[PDB]
Amino acid sequence: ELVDPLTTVREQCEQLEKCVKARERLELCDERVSSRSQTEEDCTEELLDFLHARDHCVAHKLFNSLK
Amino acid sequence: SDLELHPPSYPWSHRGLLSSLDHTSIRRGFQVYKQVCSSCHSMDYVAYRHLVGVCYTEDEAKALAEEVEVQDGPNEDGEMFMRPGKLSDYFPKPYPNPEAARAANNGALPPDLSYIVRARHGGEDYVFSLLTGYCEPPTGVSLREGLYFNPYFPGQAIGMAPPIYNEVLEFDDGTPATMSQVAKDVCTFLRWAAEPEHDHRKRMGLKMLLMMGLLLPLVYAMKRHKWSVLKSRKLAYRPPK
Amino acid sequence: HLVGVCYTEDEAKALAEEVEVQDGPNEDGEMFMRPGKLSDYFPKPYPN
Amino acid sequence: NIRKSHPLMKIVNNAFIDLPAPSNISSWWNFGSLLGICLILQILTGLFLAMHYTSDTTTAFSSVTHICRDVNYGWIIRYMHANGASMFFICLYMHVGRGLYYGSYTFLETWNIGVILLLTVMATAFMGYVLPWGQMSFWGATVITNLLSAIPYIGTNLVEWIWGGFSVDKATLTRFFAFHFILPFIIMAIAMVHLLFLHETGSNNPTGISSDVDKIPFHPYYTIKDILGALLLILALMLLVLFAPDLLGDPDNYTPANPLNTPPHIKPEWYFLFAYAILRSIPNKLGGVLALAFSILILALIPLLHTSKQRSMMFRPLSQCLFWALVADLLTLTWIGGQPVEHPYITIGQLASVLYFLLILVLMPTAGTIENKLLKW
Amino acid sequence: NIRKSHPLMKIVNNAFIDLPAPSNISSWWNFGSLLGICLILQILTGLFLAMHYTSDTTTAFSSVTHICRDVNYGWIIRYMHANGASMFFICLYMHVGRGLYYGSYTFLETWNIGVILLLTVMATAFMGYVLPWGQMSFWGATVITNLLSAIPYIGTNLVEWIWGGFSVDKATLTRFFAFHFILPFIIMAIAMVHLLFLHETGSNNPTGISSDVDKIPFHPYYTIKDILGALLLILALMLLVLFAPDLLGDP
Amino acid sequence: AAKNVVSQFVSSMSASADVLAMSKIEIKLSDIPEGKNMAFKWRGKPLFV
Amino acid sequence: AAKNVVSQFVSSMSASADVLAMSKIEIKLSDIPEGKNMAFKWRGKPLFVRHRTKKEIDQEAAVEVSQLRDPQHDLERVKKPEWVILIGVCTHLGCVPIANAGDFGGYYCPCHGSHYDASGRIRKGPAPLNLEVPSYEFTSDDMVIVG
Amino acid sequence: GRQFGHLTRVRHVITYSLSPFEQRAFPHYFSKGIPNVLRRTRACILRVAPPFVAFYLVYTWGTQEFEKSKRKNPA
Amino acid sequence: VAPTLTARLYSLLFRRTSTFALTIVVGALFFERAFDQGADAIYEHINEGKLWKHIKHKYEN
Ligand SMILES: CCCCCCCCCCCCCCCC(=O)OC[C@H](COP(=O)(O)OCCN)OC(=O)CCCCCCCCCCCCCCC
Ligand SMILES: CCCCCCCCCCCCCCCCCC(=O)OC[C@H](COP(=O)(O)OCCN)OC(=O)CCCCCCCCCCCCC
Ligand code: HEC
Ligand code: HEM
Ligand code: HEM
Ligand code: HEM
Ligand code: HEM
Ligand SMILES: C[C@@]1(c2ccc(Oc3ccccc3)nc2)OC(=O)N(Nc2ccccc2)C1=O
Ligand code: FES
Ligand SMILES: [Cl-]
User: Fold this and answer.
1) How many CB pairs under 8 A join B and D?
2) What domain count does chain B have?
3) DSSP conformation class of B47
4) Residues of C in contact with B97 (CB under 8 A)
5) Where is heme c annotated to bind (chain B)?
């Protein structure tokens, strides 16, 4: 129906060599703590440092498609 | 959950040293505030007259004020009553006091937005990233009902449900109301709300730099002119022997 | 202001409690009525 | 000749026109007049801000917004006053640092009167920051005023007496406004006694050697040099006001005061961060409060710690390095002052606080004695 | 001898201790120091009134009542400040009348500086009377400020510019408070230039004849005479404050 | 430069934006019979009708 | 005479009659379950009212009292161990501690690092005294009067 | 306040001065000024610089250490 | 223009202080008109779309 420019710029930034390693290390943490029985650790760190690279790449190009 | 994620720097068109706000984006941003934000967020320090000559004509801003009813009085019987808004009225508050607001928002208090861009580190970069930055909680994070995961909010647990999405409004000029578009315009408007002097200050800043670029070397030249008597003076010592 | 001029503290407290005054908001955002206390000003008979 | 005989112009002539001044005073001697320019700037901008300010706790926040939104050019006056206060502290620390490097403290009356001027300007600016009634305004007033609670056996009485209540409240803000209004005029009067004692001896110069053999009249040499420096002060001020008016402020101050919640990241203004860092390096309550006061009052002791047989550091390399170790150490405390109380900043701030007092009390006086022996006198 | 050589005490010595003064100056020469006592009284009482005063039109009236009802001894400070202003004008007119009778106006710089002091104290007291925001406060501000409307071709602009609006309103009261605060300190500074020019010649005396043949030091003769006169000023002030605080005001 | 600063400080005293934002007044003519001077309020000062 | 004037001007700065006219606070105890620190307002500054668990009452009961900066046993501060009421002002310099935080599971002050426990006693950091305990009595099992 | 004619004693010293309307206000501004700045910088760099270099290294280490300590370690 | 330009400005306008002041007050008058005119034209060129006076044509009424 309506294509947000944020969608087509987001996944474009994820193929960069810098942040593909951040998404990999996040999916690792998803599998590490999911396996334990009773724990309290979470993957907040591994998510934020992934968004720090992606959102940094989104800002340089995103505003060129907006009015 | 004391980790922090800071917002990146978006290339706003008013970011530059001499760069004014985009007043078409202000106009669209006001429409976002009215239709979407005004039902939970007050703006106690902006009045309809502040819009005049910024993003609406006087006639447009008058008609906009008349679209809401506000309290006035007393009349000759001592009763309060309702009338259409006029240019001198401040934007209506959605709640009479913060206690009603907390009760209507699962205990959380939507802050006044008059100064939100100046009262938060990162300004419109923060607000833009917050509105457009919602996502599912990471593994191991379980938020209580009523709260929503947002990684840019301190603590990553915010009591505001995502307020914007595709086609939340239709713009008067036909602009596609995509999430990023709506966010960009509302943030631009909120910047103006917090710093209406923005454009005028940048114009003054340009004049200040040009005059200083004139006056600094001329006043410097006056200093050296007078001091040249001393800087080229020559001394000689001739004692009797 | 009455205390120690023409009434005792207990007398002036009881006098304040003979009227109802508005207070609030409570946790629901509503105003409500309570008995007067020593810190309340004398009730106005009309709002304006 | 009529400039000299009129009862009123003779004072102006003997202070700004025919005043004998050294021929070689550097740009570091410009900050004296810039401090007076700053004091006059703050009085004018401040006076025009009091025409549209209300000291009511319920409208104090809104009256400042009313200035920056509805008053014709009220915002530019407002941000000149705020940034002018920061420029005031830039000039103070350079004025002080000039006198320490070049040995100008040997004018005891002028120096000691100077220390009084520093403290009153500090008191003035602290109360000024409380007036807009933001979050940092309120909790700035809470922390600093509570320092008197450290005074044994009378502290709480002095605090509650100053507050006008059991906490900072409406009575505290209204009186801080009265103090903030009047204290600049007392400062201007004390600045005249500052200059009165100075003219008894005339100015020092970069060499620390007497300059009576080579004097020039203040006019036209230092009138135009002071005019040029003022234009550079206006440049520094207007860059902040017209391009970055919130860079030196705190964003939390744009939220109205709330006695029920304190922000997590307390950060004072930049000109208090070095002394804020000294206080918290001492966990004892009274000990840390005394170290705060002594970090400033130690200036009154600098004349008694002068050991060198030379006045200025121009010819004292060992003292120069220790002088700049004090500036970088003060720059470290300013940095630590702006960071939260956590590892490793706690230990760095403790080591820097010791180095600050170690330099002034021990190392610098010992360097001046080593230098005397190296020159064989 | 140390009173004479210290850079700061030499000013105090040559003005209040070793100052040669005429041996025959009457009680009419006491009002000079009483004007300074009045100026210092108004600054102290006034400063303590600004600690509990709000210049909001909606609370300016109530903040003054709050002083006279709830502030510890706020009323006595308040009525000292009001009656002190009236005592200020009693001393002004006697000081002026003294100079007219005895010809002291022949000190032109001192006299002309005096006329400036009279006008600024008049401007100060007018704005002070507007602050409590009573009926006479408001209509006093209305009438006197409208006097500028009489100036041809710029009068209404000067009036509306001063008012901050088309009439006396909240903007007028807030600025009158700022002026009323600062103008006394300018008066104190101008009072020093008043004394500076006076000391060039020294005082006149009741005979109008030069008194250099018979001079006495200011201390201890006129220090104690000025102390006695101050006690009589306090008597005149405290009679009003403590027995008739509304006699000179308007209901 | 000196003109601009002195001018801006001058306009600071001139009436603010909110003061200039005076709104008109609705007057109900049925409340004013003959021989009466009804006193309203407009701009702060009275408006005799 | 000079004493009387200087005294009266001194009392002028002391808190006025209206400031001293502080009224007590009605606290609804049914709004405070276990493990919660409900924050009220009293005298202007916060009034923390907290309901403690058995895992907290016995934790603070067993404590080396001789080693404390301000020695005071938990039993002689609260009339009822289940209910504890504290003034939410830090004793160091008047900041508002964040409830149910810090190392000791009590209150932590973000301003300069003062640590408290479930009893409100000072255990670490720069603050020199325990949190203030007001005078209160339990008139019944649903309402508590503070003052 | 002191005044000219009462400052000190001087003998046998001649001073030659030129009117300011007879000479340049910026004589050899770059051709001579830049060499003098380099001379003065060299003479004082070793006294002023090492303290602030020491600050820069302590600043960066303390910030790096504070950042790593806030990141958690596997149990 | 055989005499120097600066030389003729001095003899006519700068020698007397009165005409030296008149040239300044008259210069500030014409400088103010041209400086504000050129300064505003530069601030507007950088921001050609963004300002309101560049959009006032849409909102005719
Ligand atoms: C009673 C009066 C008290 C005044 C006290 C002032 C205290 C001194 C403060 C110094 C302020 C610096 C200038 C602000 C410029 C501004 O802000 O002016 C903004 C204006 C544009 O304004 P505009 O775009 O609206 O167009 C205007 C409508 N035609 O151009 C400027 O930048 C001019 C400034 C040039 C650069 C600064 C040069 C500094 C010279 C010093 C002169 C100081 C005079 C001293 C007066 C007491
Ligand atoms: C108090 C809280 C303060 C917090 C803020 C701290 C931030 C500090 C940031 C660093 C500021 C650096 C300022 C620039 C210094 C330049 C030094 C320089 O140019 O070289 C040294 C200079 C040499 O000149 P001489 O006079 O010895 O001989 C000249 C012969 N050609 O000799 C000089 O010119 C020295 C003159 C004195 C310099 C004054 C700097 C003082 C800094 C503040 C001191 C605070 C003390 C309380
Ligand atoms: C109710 C349905 C809301 C809508 C519509 C909007 N907001 Fe909101 N907001 C709401 C609440 C309950 C809160 C409090 C959250 C909390 O946990 O305290 C907020 C808060 C904000 C904030 C402040 C974020 C911060 O850093 O503190 C911002 C900047 C904000 N909201 C922006 C915003 C905008 C731009 C909206 C319209 C597009 C908007 N909100 C709508 C509730 C509601
Ligand atoms: C409002 C604050 C101040 C003002 C307006 C002020 C003003 C001045 C002026 C005009 C001079 C002469 C010119 C000059 O040397 O630049 C001077 C000199 C001096 N000041 Fe200050 N000053 C202030 C604060 C201080 C402080 C806080 C100190 C020290 C603690 C101080 C110490 C000195 C010294 C030692 C001199 C003599 C310098 C020399 O002769 O080389 N002053 N001051
Ligand atoms: C040495 C002189 C002065 C200094 C250093 C100083 C400093 C300050 C500072 C730092 C603030 C806080 C500004 C802010 O947070 O926005 C302030 C506010 C204020 N000052 Fe001053 N000030 C001085 C003199 C004066 C004078 C003389 C007056 C009035 C006659 C005045 C009136 C005000 C007012 C009304 C405010 C509140 C408005 C505001 O917050 O901007 N000041 N001052
Ligand atoms: C704040 C207002 C004033 C103060 C504080 C003040 C203070 C003084 C003082 C202390 C003296 C010397 C002692 C004395 O003669 O009593 C004096 C003398 C004098 N004053 Fe004033 N004065 C003020 C206003 C005026 C005014 C308004 C005028 C005239 C229009 C004036 C005219 C004179 C004259 C002529 C003298 C010399 C008297 C003589 O030598 O006999 N003064 N003033
Ligand atoms: C020559 C010095 C002064 C004179 C003659 C003077 C006179 C007056 C007068 C006549 C009033 C009206 C009092 C009333 O109607 O109740 C007044 C009020 C007031 N004055 Fe002054 N005043 C002076 C200096 C000052 C100073 C220095 C301050 C503050 C620092 C001040 C603060 C006030 C305040 C806050 C009020 C309002 C409270 C009230 O109405 O009592 N005054 N003044
Ligand atoms: C502006 C300011 C101030 C002014 C003046 C001031 O004097 C000094 C400057 C240097 C040395 C000694 C004193 N010290 C702080 O007042 C104020 O509340 N804060 N912030 C704040 C917040 C929390 C705690 C403490 C302070 C300031 O930084
Ligand atoms: S204010 Fe709480 S630890 Fe200092
Ligand atoms: Cl604000």
Assistant:
1) 65
2) 2
3) B
4) 25, 29
5) 37, 40-41, 160
